[PDB]
Write a protein that binds this ligand. Structure first.
Ligand SMILES: CCCCC/C=C\C/C=C\CCCCCCCC(=O)O[C@H](COC(=O)CCCCCCCCCCCCCCC)COP(=O)([O-])OCC[N+](C)(C)C
Ligand SMILES: CCCCC/C=C\C/C=C\CCCCCCCC(=O)O[C@H](COC(=O)CCCCCCCCCCCCCCC)COP(=O)([O-])OCC[N+](C)(C)C
Ligand SMILES: CCCCCCCCCCCCCCCCCC(=O)OC[C@@H](O)COP(=O)(O)OCCN
Ligand SMILES: CCCCCCCCCCCCCCCCCC(=O)OC[C@@H](O)COP(=O)(O)OCCN
Ligand SMILES: CCCCCCCCCCCCCCCC(=O)O
Ligand SMILES: CCCCCCCCCCCCCCCC(=O)O
Ligand SMILES: CCCCCCCCCCCCCCCC(=O)O
Ligand SMILES: CCCCCCCCCCCCCCCC(=O)O
Ligand SMILES: CCCCCCCCCCCCCCCC(=O)O
Ligand SMILES: CCCCCCCCCCCCCCCC(=O)O
Ligand SMILES: CCCCCCCCCCCCCCCC(=O)O
Ligand SMILES: CCCCCCCCCCCCCCCC(=O)O
Ligand SMILES: CCCCCCCCCCCCCCCC(=O)O
Ligand SMILES: CCCCCCCCCCCCCCCC(=O)O
Ligand SMILES: CCCCCCCCCCCCCCCC(=O)O
Ligand SMILES: CCCCCCCCCCCCCCCC(=O)O
Ligand SMILES: CCCCCCCCCCCCCCCC(=O)O
Ligand SMILES: CCCCCCCCCCCCCCCC(=O)O
Ligand SMILES: CCCCCCCCCCCCCCCC(=O)O
Ligand SMILES: CCCCCCCCCCCCCCCC(=O)O
Ligand SMILES: CCCCCCCCCCCCCCCC(=O)O
Ligand SMILES: CCCCCCCCCCCCCCCC(=O)O
Ligand SMILES: CCCCCCCCCCCCCCCC(=O)O
Ligand SMILES: CCCCCCCCCCCCCCCC(=O)O
Lengths: 574, 574
């Protein structure tokens, strides 16, 4: 509805401006530096480089704009730079589309053109990032799972040392058996004059729990190699003729290793995957109810705000559930669990929000002709939703009002020591688990309606363009990376953008059909092209993202690695 | 039709008996030993062990029956033994089915039970065969493709030696660049008093062609390692970040290497695959015409013989085309090209013969009720077809009348030397390229009609049971293996038997539906079970067939390998 649409844009716009003014004002106050420039503070940099102490209100835009991809990588990592490739690839595609705005072929060609070049670019970026990388513990290690039980008279450790030494008698350093939840919990309590008495009791509990952990057969271990080349090859090889025994993959970064899942055996992993995938499919079906609510609501005070707020509230609970469920499948690493969570989220983005909202909306208003006319009207909801996210969402992301309020309240009433005050402002990472899925939803909708309800394209341009600028500022000044996946996220993104294009092509095949267009058939070739394109891109670039190439593993060492430090890096609670 | 059915069984039966009597008579004559016992002759064994020179006419049955799988492997190879696993797995499944003959669940459970145990058995058989294997050239080598062109000033060989030495500086022995069709053709002519003058001219042509070959950049090479472990690992690893450069796989057995395809670049391979797969799909569509002919024909003199003869004639031309097309895709090895040919054949077995004959037959005679009643009648054609193959087909396979006639005519009129006489009787191999696809067709039909037209099950039992006995005799006395794939064929077979079961379950879901059975829905769980079963079997056993496990590669050597002989083994035309 038009009136409600303008009201929502108006409210989101004004809130955006207010937040922009609070940002301009508050970000120039030194007392808020822990909130507005924590990445620079943690890295030992001045909050800003002007030095005059009279910062121009638009200085941040100039700084964000005159910053190259290389500066983003040098300061915040490859994954961070890849996130910007994603945002600009999309912006380039939509801007090209709007220059023209039949258009289906234009968009598909532009999309294929940019995905081809973007995948090529990231593959190059990643290769260079790996090429200059320093010595890290995960470069020398593999994760071994599904070990069989040892024979009587031998323990689990001895058994694994024996197995690997026979295969790799020279290039074998250590095996750390993945043994202890009670100990971890009690130890945490111990780490945390009645308080002193409580601490003593907690320490005693930790000792008891540690004894139980010592008593505990295990089925997994982390194995270390003396060289990058050997580890790279070991992780790629079959160790037993029995596929289900002693299975080997590359070890996750120490910061990413999900220790609690390492002793889940292959078949238990298979069972968990089927029950979890099943559970998720069931969850998707229950989410049809919250979606029906959002679509049914779409007087002004509710239409302009409630459909969007409710959709945000229900979807906001998914990342927590989905990441939990992914960890529960037996996944060994945090970045994989995150990609998996994003994968599950995507299925909600497609079946509950794009399809769900669109269909439910269509069903509330010559049947085929009616449906064809009704479909484009759902775009107004989506234009509002997208604007809400780029005006208020980015308004809050840039102004950091919520973190600022919480921080000052903790500093004044709860924090007693300097350490507590610093914990209160630690910025966290970019939350790829919620951020990428968010952007993927915007793309799904913008692509799907790009030639049905074309104004959405401008909103898509602003969302991605403004996001580029807002997040470029946050990437440089606020967030701190928690793990480095080296662009391993890109193939996830590539496949989902291409999937969105695929869905678009399928939708236009059907929509042109709804309008009974004689030549809908000409889009079948695009549907086929998308599948072939995907296949070819996978054949040309994909494997380069799963493994470090031996030509990279074989790089000249700056110095010999200390394998003992490498080993220590993987021992929790010590 | 019943009369024609009995006539075909009668004729096939009598021909079978005549061929069995000719076999009994002729196989006891010493002059035919080169035809009836060539495997034993080539191996230096007496044609038969009785020594009395008075062989019992049924002695061959006793010998074929009291022969274990181990004796088949020891004499004729693993692939040969696997072929027998295939035949007996199927026999066990059908015999169990006939004990009961709702039945859909019985059959599916028996089938899952036997496939599980058969896959387990073969995996064990294969592992043992690899475990006791001797030193062979393919155990120490990889095939490298899609090499980039060298920089100016360096040649292709130098460029590959440089690339691999940097990655594997110690475990690197040789690189044989895959350089020469004109030379091969002219050399063959040279190898083959006007005849002396012709030979001299052919030798001159060979020299000229050799010079042209010497002049010839290349994109592939065979690389040798100093150890089984290193080769096994190299073949499993990524060498470049650019996926399409320097791609590496395990080298094919020297006897299997399809040299003409090694210089086809990745993207040309991708193009060839799409055009070839396309061509094959088109061929499948043109084959619908020969099928329509066969079904339309199905007075007595034609009904009893022509539908079957024509079907045999048209299908008989496929193995030649399909193997050619597979080689044309850029496949590096003969056993892979054969599996690929069998794969393509399977699609004809499914779309041109099972579906094609069944559908066309149904269309030549309350629509759903009519179709349900009509479908089972096609089984009579198939019972005839199967009996034709086990009575006349096996009759000829055992009696070897055609090879015998040709052999004696060559020996008497064309062969002048002893060498020519021996060439005339060389038995060849088991022709897995035509033999496995043949048996797969019988299974597709027997499974699909096992509860629709149940008598087919008895014919299926006889086909596989009698084939076991007839081919057990041929496996021990007649055929000579041309390559050894070590059971690599089994996953092809497993997946196709399971695919046949899957098709059966889909067909019964539909057929029970055709009879408007209330509980057709209960078969959906079997369809799902089949897919999960496949997935689980793949996860548990499959990888063990793609690579030799490092625990096997690491077996103690009897003696150090001669790497130079290993290298020579891969050089054609020298
Ligand atoms: C009828 C339609 C009329 C015309 C079309 C409509 C809208 C166009 C919108 C944006 C410009 C297109 C950029 C394509 C880049 C693809 C390749 C790549 O990846 O670019 C990247 C990223 O550049 C970008 O996007 C920058 C985006 C800037 C933020 C604001 C954007 C607009 C949002 C507000 C509302 C819309 C106003 C539109 C006015 C025309 C280059 O790399 P970098 O990060 O190393 O350098 C970064 C820059 N240095 C070289 C100077 C260091
Ligand atoms: C209402 C229905 C009535 C009853 C059911 C109907 C028909 C039953 C047909 C055949 C027997 C079942 C064999 C299952 C084996 C599965 C596991 C395995 O793999 O077995 C294999 C292979 O054994 C076989 O099949 C042998 C087949 C023999 C050739 C003739 C078969 C019948 C064809 C003629 C017409 C039908 C007459 C039927 C009369 C009842 C065992 O291993 P091997 O090769 O090391 O030893 C080989 C044998 N040594 C241990 C002594 C060395
Ligand atoms: C009467 C009935 C009316 C129905 C009306 C609603 C119809 C729409 C519902 C659609 C349900 C979709 C369920 C399938 C997605 C859930 C499973 C799953 O999540 O598993 C897949 C892996 O693809 C995950 O792979 P992932 O771990 O992400 O890999 C990342 C790195 N490679
Ligand atoms: C108006 C129209 C009426 C139509 C009526 C007829 C309908 C039935 C026609 C069906 C056409 C089927 C075509 C697809 C098979 C051909 C491709 C192909 O061959 O490629 C696949 C890889 O699966 C091969 O894999 P492979 O090399 O065997 O691997 C072995 C070891 N892993
Ligand atoms: C769609 C764009 C809307 C405008 C949003 C940005 C508003 C920021 C305006 C900042 C102006 C601050 C001027 C203060 C000058 C001073 O330091 O005295
Ligand atoms: C529309 C405004 C709502 C949000 C409230 C804004 C008022 C400031 C809240 C943060 C308290 C810290 C103020 C700056 C302290 C300093 O001067 O260093
Ligand atoms: C219906 C048929 C459509 C076919 C369209 C396929 C278009 C090819 C895909 C884009 C490739 C872009 C290549 C860029 C090369 C480069 O700059 O490195
Ligand atoms: C169907 C038309 C296809 C051609 C579109 C031309 C778009 C303008 C040229 C852009 C060149 C820059 C490439 C950037 C690749 C990237 O980093 O994503
Ligand atoms: C909600 C439906 C759940 C479906 C669950 C399917 C899980 C299949 C698990 C197969 C386990 C195979 C065990 C093999 C053990 C062995 O033989 O070594
Ligand atoms: C209620 C419907 C639920 C349907 C869920 C289907 C889940 C299929 C899972 C098997 C597909 C292959 C995934 C492989 C993942 C891995 O490599 O571990
Ligand atoms: C919740 C139970 C799952 C219900 C849906 C069935 C899912 C079947 C998954 C089969 C995956 C097959 C992937 C491997 C391909 C192969 O067999 O070669
Ligand atoms: C004037 C009436 C105001 C009523 C609500 C104000 C506008 C709604 C903003 C609340 C939700 C904002 C959440 C957006 C950030 C996000 O995407 O999570
Ligand atoms: C009609 C089109 C439907 C569109 C939704 C497609 C959902 C699937 C998303 C892409 C899955 C990609 C699978 C490859 C493995 C991987 O995820 O890395
Ligand atoms: C509808 C059937 C035909 C469709 C065939 C589509 C094949 C296009 C796949 C993408 C390849 C792009 C290669 C670009 C390389 C270059 O020119 O630089
Ligand atoms: C379905 C089975 C039909 C029978 C087919 C097998 C017939 C073979 C009979 C051979 C008997 C030969 C007796 C000769 C005795 C002798 O040496 O004098
Ligand atoms: C129905 C018979 C048709 C086939 C012709 C069978 C007659 C024998 C043909 C083969 C010739 C060799 C005969 C055996 C020579 C020998 O005694 O060593
Ligand atoms: C509709 C649900 C049907 C489910 C049926 C699944 C039956 C399990 C598959 C057969 C497993 C046989 C295990 C044999 C174990 C052994 O002897 O080693
Ligand atoms: C649904 C019923 C399942 C049980 C069927 C029982 C069949 C009899 C037992 C056969 C044991 C021999 C296994 C041989 C496995 C093989 O080599 O293929
Ligand atoms: C009958 C239809 C045939 C369809 C043929 C599709 C073949 C697609 C081939 C893609 C080639 C990609 C070339 C990439 C070269 C490069 O950029 O390095
Ligand atoms: C006329 C219709 C023809 C349809 C042919 C479809 C061919 C699809 C080929 C791509 C599927 C993946 C095969 C991978 C084989 C490989 O690993 O080299
Ligand atoms: C003859 C032209 C082919 C026409 C039919 C289209 C075949 C598309 C094949 C796509 C294979 C995709 C396999 C890789 C899966 C992925 O993209 O992750
Ligand atoms: C009495 C009339 C005889 C007419 C034809 C005789 C029976 C037909 C046999 C000829 C075809 C035999 C081919 C079967 C072997 C095969 O499967 O290739
Ligand atoms: C409705 C069921 C149709 C039955 C025909 C199925 C045709 C596909 C045959 C099996 C393909 C297996 C693919 C896995 C890769 C491989 O072949 O090794
Ligand atoms: C219809 C949904 C449920 C179907 C689930 C089917 C799972 C069966 C997969 C085969 C596993 C057989 C494991 C046998 C191991 C053993 O007991 O020895």
């Amino acid at each position: 509805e038009f009136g409600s649409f303008l009201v929502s844009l108006g409210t989101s716009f004004v809130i955006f401006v207010i937040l922009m003014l609070l940002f301009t004002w508050l970000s120039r106050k030194s007392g808020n530096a822990p909130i507005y420039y924590p990445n620079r503070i943690l890295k030992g940099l001045e909050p800003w480089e002007g030095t005059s102490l009279t910062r121009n209100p638009f200085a941040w835009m100039r700084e964000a704009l005159t910053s190259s991809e290389q500066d983003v990588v040098n300061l915040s990592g490859v994954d961070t730079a890849v996130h910007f490739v994603f945002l600009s690839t999309v912006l380039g595609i939509f801007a090209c589309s709007s220059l023209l705005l039949g258009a289906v072929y234009w968009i598909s060609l532009v999309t294929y053109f940019f995905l081809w070049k973007a995948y090529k670019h990231v593959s190059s970026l990643r290769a260079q990032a790996l090429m200059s990388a320093d010595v890290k513990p995960e470069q020398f290690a593999i994760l071994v799972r599904d070990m069989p039980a040892p024979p009587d008279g031998q323990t689990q450790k001895e058994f694994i040392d024996s197995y690997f030494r026979e295969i790799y008698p020279e290039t074998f350093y250590r095996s750390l058996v993945a043994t202890x939840x009670x100990x971890x919990x009690x130890x945490x309590x111990x780490x945390x004059x009645x308080x002193x008495x409580x601490x003593x009791x907690x320490x005693x509990x930790x000792x008891x729990x540690x004894x139980x952990x010592x008593x505990x057969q295990q089925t997994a271990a982390v194995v270390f190699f003396t060289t990058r080349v050997a580890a790279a090859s070991a992780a790629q090889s079959l160790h037993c003729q029995m596929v289900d025994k002693w299975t080997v993959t590359e070890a996750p970064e120490p910061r990413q290793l999900l220790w609690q899942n390492l002793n889940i055996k292959l078949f238990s992993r298979i069972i968990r995957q089927y029950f979890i995938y099943f559970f998720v499919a069931v969850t998707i079906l229950f989410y049809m109810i919250p979606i029906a609510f959002v679509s049914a609501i779409t007087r002004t005070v509710l239409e302009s705000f409630l459909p969007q707020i409710a959709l945000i509230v229900f979807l906001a609970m998914l990342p927590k559930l989905l990441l939990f469920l992914s960890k529960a499948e037996g996944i060994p690493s945090q970045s994989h669990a995150i990609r998996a969570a994003s994968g599950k989220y995507f299925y909600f983005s497609v079946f509950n929000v794009f399809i769900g909202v669109t269909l439910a909306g269509t069903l509330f208003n010559m049947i085929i002709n009616l449906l064809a006319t009704s479909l484009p009207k759902s775009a107004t909801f989506f234009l509002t939703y997208v604007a809400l996210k780029f005006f208020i969402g980015y308004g809050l992301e840039l102004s950091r009002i919520i973190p600022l309020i919480i921080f000052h309240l903790k500093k004044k009433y709860l924090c007693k020591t300097e350490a507590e005050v610093k914990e209160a402002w630690y910025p966290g990472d970019l939350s790829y688990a919620t951020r990428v899925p968010g952007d993927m939803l915007i793309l799904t909708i913008t692509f799907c309606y790009s030639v049905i309800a074309p104004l959405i394209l401008i909103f898509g341009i602003t969302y991605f363009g403004l996001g580029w600028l807002v997040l470029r500022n946050q990437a440089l000044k606020v967030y701190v990376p928690s793990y480095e996946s080296y662009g391993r996220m890109w193939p996830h993104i590539h496949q989902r953008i291409l999937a969105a294009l695929f869905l678009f092509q399928v939708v236009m095949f059907g929509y042109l059909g709804a309008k009974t267009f004689f030549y809908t058939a000409l889009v079948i070739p695009l549907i086929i092209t998308s599948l072939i394109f995907g296949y070819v891109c996978r054949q040309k670039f994909y494997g380069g993202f799963e493994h470090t190439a031996l030509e990279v593993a074989c790089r000249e060492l700056k110095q010999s690695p200390d394998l003992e430090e490498i080993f220590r890096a993987y021992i929790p609670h010590s």
